Amino acid sequence: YTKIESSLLLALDYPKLDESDFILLLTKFLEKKLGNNDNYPTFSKQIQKYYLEQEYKKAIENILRLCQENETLLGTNLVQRLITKSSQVTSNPKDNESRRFYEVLYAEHLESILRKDFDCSIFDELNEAYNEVRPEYTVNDLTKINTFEEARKLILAFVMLNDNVELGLKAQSAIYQKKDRSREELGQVLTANPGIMKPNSPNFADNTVPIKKIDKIAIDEKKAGGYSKTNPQVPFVASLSGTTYSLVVVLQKYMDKHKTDPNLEKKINNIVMLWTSAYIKDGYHSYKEVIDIFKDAHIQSIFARANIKLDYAIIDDTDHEFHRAQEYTQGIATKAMMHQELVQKVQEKS
């Protein structure tokens, strides 16, 4: 084994390695080994797209297929070890550190895309639709939206609609009954980590945020068929996003008010992208909770009846966040392995 192969094999020995961890590590190794191939960039793009959509089974299958196709350059023993490790990884909703890091970075990238060529007309019209949706007891001081800050403020102020206007959508929903969030009020905890990254998780020195209090949310383990239990690849920051039903109501008013808009689908996708970026970056929800609200059968029917094709904020250029998450994965795995070795060394020393 060379130095790179030995480093990869040691990182794969990380006891808390999950499917995202494995995908990132093996993609980094395959880029460093077979990256010179002409067809590799297509494979890397497909793997990154699978990872963004949390299609971890498909990503792992594609990675294993590539490894078997290059079993001579890599090594039969190494490929066999990778195959064995592929079936040994799982996902913990409470502990997906690489996924939380990647989702924070991808929310930041979504925000960067949003700020470039920002169209304020879309969110002015969304504010108008919000004014014709919200009840009389909810105030709205956003008379006009001219900047990305005001649009994000309106997105975040959509939370005053909860339990009033989206109740019908939640009742019609078949997956919201599987939402598993503890009713217990655990208070707030301090953090220096951005977005949905856990407070105690390691972070890059340039990635920390000013210390702030965030709500402590637990999983309802007593729930039967809970969303977190059913979908463990999704990092549990909260349960299914109920405020996104309020967003869907506001978007219904938006679409019925702009049925003749030629770029209606693009505007709705822009709004959904801003919603996802704001909710991941503020630590309210992970990507798949919001997106699975958008993927509900009756919500999908609502969006299909308006001739709207949602892209679910999926972008085709996630190379930077993917590689940074790979570096974060390598750091965490190597640090844990070294911690094992250091604990053993000091224990044997004394």
């Binding site: 301090l190 407070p199 105690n200 390691p202 020195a205 000091v346």
Partner: protein, 359 residues
């Protein structure tokens, strides 16, 4: 390939080789300028030179004198070529990221090290005790730090800094000894006062009881031999000087004692890791070398913490060099050889790689 471990403190730079159990070169972190002199040479020529401290409160503020300190460490103290040794450096908790970037840039472009790593001093102190989770009180010479560490990561949201360390205790001891009629106003007098602080001062379990005993009896009075043949007696100052750690108001500081800052750090952490922090309280630094400081910390934290909580204070005898000991343990590990930021990685990524590799 021998790794250099260099712990740069505010008052003492401790440098040596990985695998050794003691810093081969412990010298004052001072730079004398009239060409410059670094370390014991600048201290000896105190009158002729102007002394400057490149590190204050554990943070490097003057990078030129820091470069001089590192050059003296590599060539004039360790007598090794920096280009053939991976140099593991140490940094203060909550160190600015620009400082880490400048550190790696100076290591790679000025000294041409083949590899380097930067680690938090408190994390290395915890490593020296064989722990990855626990709260470390690292009181050196310029600053005191309460650093809770979870699985090798120092939690930025719960670390606190108390501007109270050995320098303040030495100044307070000078003030009290002046209150007794002993004139200590010069730099040599400062050094001999620091010697008395190291040799005689201790932490009292009960400060009021110790003060009452000193007022009543004379059992706590100890004799010390001054450099100029004089013999001076020190009484209640043996525990009054270190008590400023637990009662900063002795020097007019509005902050809280080290026990209270420790409790505040533990409270700033999640309730699920508070038990681990309470059970792993690691003392580190020269200012933690006072006799009885561990017992006093245990008593005060037991008073502050919930009654059912288990509190263990870890104060190894070598806790003065625990940062360097942990660094030497780290840099001599087989799994650590891949964490070295190599010259190729620095060239392809720039200094910012320190945030991605040293975290």
């Amino acid at each position: 390939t021998t790794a250099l471990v260099c712990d740069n403190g505010s008052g003492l730079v401790k440098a040596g080789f990985a695998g050794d159990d003691a810093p081969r070169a412990v010298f004052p972190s001072i730079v004398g300028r009239p060409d410059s002199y670094v370390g014991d040479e600048a201290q000896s020529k105190r009158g002729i030179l102007t002394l400057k401290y490149p590190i204050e409160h554990g943070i490097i503020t003057n990078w030129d004198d820091m470069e001089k300190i590192w050059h003296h460490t590599f060539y004039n103290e360790l007598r090794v070529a920096p280009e053939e040794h991976p140099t593991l450096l140490t940094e203060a908790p909550l160190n600015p990221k620009a400082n880490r970037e400048k550190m790696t840039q100076i290591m790679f472009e000025t000294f041409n090290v083949p590899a380097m790593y930067v680690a938090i001093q408190a994390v290395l102190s915890l490593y020296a005790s064989g722990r990855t989770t626990g709260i470390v009180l690292d009181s050196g010479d310029g600053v005191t730090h309460n650093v809770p560490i979870y699985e090798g990561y120092a939690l930025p949201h719960a670390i606190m800094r108390l501007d109270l360390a050995g320098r303040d205790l030495t100044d307070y001891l000078m003030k009290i000894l002046t209150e007794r009629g002993y004139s200590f106003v010069t730099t040599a007098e400062r050094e001999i006062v620091r010697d008395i602080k190291e040799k005689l001062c201790y932490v009292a379990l009960d400060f009021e009881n110790e003060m009452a005993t000193a007022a009543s009896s004379s059992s706590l009075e100890k004799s010390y031999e001054l450099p100029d043949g004089q013999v001076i007696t020190i009484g209640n100052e043996r525990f009054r000087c270190p008590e400023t750690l637990f009662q900063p108001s002795f020097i007019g500081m509005e902050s809280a004692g080290i026990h209270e800052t420790t409790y505040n750090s533990i409270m700033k952490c999640d309730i699920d890791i508070r038990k681990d922090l309470y059970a792993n309280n690691v003392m580190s630094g020269g200012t933690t070398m006072y006799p009885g400081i561990a017992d006093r910390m245990q008593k005060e934290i037991t008073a502050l913490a919930p009654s059912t909580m288990k509190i263990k204070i870890i104060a190894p005898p070598e806790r003065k060099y625990s940062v360097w000991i942990g660094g030497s343990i780290l840099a001599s590990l087989s799994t650590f050889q891949q964490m070295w930021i190599t010259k190729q990685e620095y060239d392809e990524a720039g200094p910012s790689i320190v945030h991605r590799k040293c975290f």
